[PDB]
Design a protein around this ligand. Structure first.
Ligand SMILES: Nc1nc(=O)c2ncn([C@@H]3O[C@H](CO)[C@@H](O)[C@H]3OP(=O)(O)OC[C@H]3O[C@@H](n4cnc5c(N)ncnc54)[C@H](O)[C@@H]3OP(=O)(O)O)c2[nH]1
Ligand SMILES: Nc1nc(=O)c2ncn([C@@H]3O[C@H](CO)[C@@H](O)[C@H]3OP(=O)(O)OC[C@H]3O[C@@H](n4cnc5c(N)ncnc54)[C@H](O)[C@@H]3OP(=O)(O)O)c2[nH]1
Lengths: 240, 240
């Protein structure tokens, strides 16, 4: 079955629309590809290392080619012969993160709402069938469309992400969090000057919550960058 | 003359509203203060060094007090006995930057539209007269309201900001810009790994333009962070 969706019966605006795709199963993971194009989180460390150098940089997407711009509506592949028509929502955003050993990418991505359960890697195309993005992560019924558009960036480091959930109202610093802001400064006094080298590269950190945060820290927990996220969902983001 | 505005005749919705302020003149520059609270860019390097430790961290604002939240309307001081009522616009945004020798702050700030020409430092208050912010920068008729609200962050470094204006469509990396993505890759290969120490702290870089960018770089221009700005104006931001 060349079906890129888990549920047996289709849901939503379905239309006849052939979009090629390839299916893979490794251990218990099942994912889809679009030629060379795969989600970064669906690759073995061997696959990640070989693709890091030959790829364009989209969050959690490996691809040897530039993706088409987004516009107002896209089609998501259901079968070899059918696809789902969905509006792109630039007001409901999801935060993506990824690492390929070279760049720790992040993106405040737009979404579309489907009640289907698409495989990671499912192709997303425009009216002309040009690949605009690939299914990566989902929060509820909202799937993240990783693209150039929207707020985004990347950290130059080999280190993977640290994904943390600080308690509500805590004063975040580095990979740590503290109950009071004064204690933050106390901990600030005890640390040395920030140190980065080839030996000890920086550490990317994502703090999920109501006050979401993107932080870059050195090996010792000293902060290099701190970024207050707004308008983006961070909690319960599932990588399919 | 206790006027916090340059133009001789008031414009806009003027209301009776007494707001304390002090006027200062250094060289040919004239700005206002609110007790301790002043704009960072209005300070001598000696004044900056003294306030860095005694301050709360708002972009281009020094203050010994926590700022009141941003409601929907604010009042801006014209003279000792009158002030202007202006609507706060969260959809037309301006990018702010500042440095105090400890934090290189940036902020996507909301704006208000006045035809008055306010001094830097003019107090901005809510209905209760609580200090909500201070006049810092403006683009055209749109003044930036520096607050906690909105997207923002800071870099830990002593270095000042580096402000560049790359040509349209160029591929930005670090402090340089290149014609295509390919040249960035070539330039990437010739560089060592980023090096940061107490001796060589990071460099904050702002790239203004259509695709505005926030970058953290080592002393030699190797990139540590890269951030694609969206939804904020960067080009004609004037620090009053
Ligand atoms: N600056 C800022 N921008 C925001 O958008 C924001 N949204 C919420 N809050 C919270 O309001 C309370 C007021 O402090 C804090 O609890 C704060 O949450 P937090 O963000 O968790 O706190 C970390 C402290 O820690 C501060 N530091 C970070 N680095 C340093 C440093 N090298 N030296 C001294 N202080 C440092 C950091 O600026 C800060 O303290 P200050 O605001 O007083 O400056 C914000 N604070
Ligand atoms: N990734 C990305 N996100 C965006 O939001 C975006 N908006 C516009 N563009 C431009 O589209 C063309 C696509 O290439 C580029 O001209 C690009 O302009 P730029 O974004 O201004 O140039 C930086 C190049 O340079 C890349 N690099 C950055 N650091 C490295 C590094 N260590 N090693 C290899 N490449 C690095 C950076 O990823 C990139 O190259 P990629 O094509 O691979 O994305 C974007 N690119």
């Amino acid at each position: 079955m060349g079906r890129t969706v888990l549920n047996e019966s289709n849901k939503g605006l379905v239309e006849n629309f052939s979009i090629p795709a390839e299916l893979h199963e490794r251990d218990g993971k099942r994912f889809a590809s679009f030629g060379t194009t795969v989600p970064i989180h669906c690759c073995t460390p061997e696959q990640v290392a070989e693709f890091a150098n030959k790829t364009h940089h989209y969050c959690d997407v490996f691809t040897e080619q530039v993706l088409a711009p987004l516009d107002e509506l896209v089609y998501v592949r259901i079968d070899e012969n059918t696809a789902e028509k969905v509006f792109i929502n630039r007001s409901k955003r999801i935060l993506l993160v990824s690492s390929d050993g070279v760049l720790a990418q992040w993106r405040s991505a737009p979404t579309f709402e489907s009640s289907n359960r698409f495989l990671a890697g499912t192709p997303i195309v425009n009216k002309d069938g040009d690949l605009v993005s690939v299914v990566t992560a989902r929060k509820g019924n909202h799937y993240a469309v990783s693209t150039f558009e929207g707020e985004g960036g990347y950290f130059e480091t080999s280190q993977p992400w640290k994904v943390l959930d600080p308690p509500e109202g805590a004063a975040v610093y580095g990979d740590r969090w503290f109950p009071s802001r004064e204690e933050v400064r106390a901990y600030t006094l005890s640390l040395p000057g920030a140190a980065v080298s080839a030996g000890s590269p920086p550490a990317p950190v994502l703090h999920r919550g109501g006050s979401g945060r993107l932080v870059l820290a050195d090996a010792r927990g000293r902060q290099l960058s701190h970024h207050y996220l707004h308008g983006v969902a961070t909690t319960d983001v599932q990588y399919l």
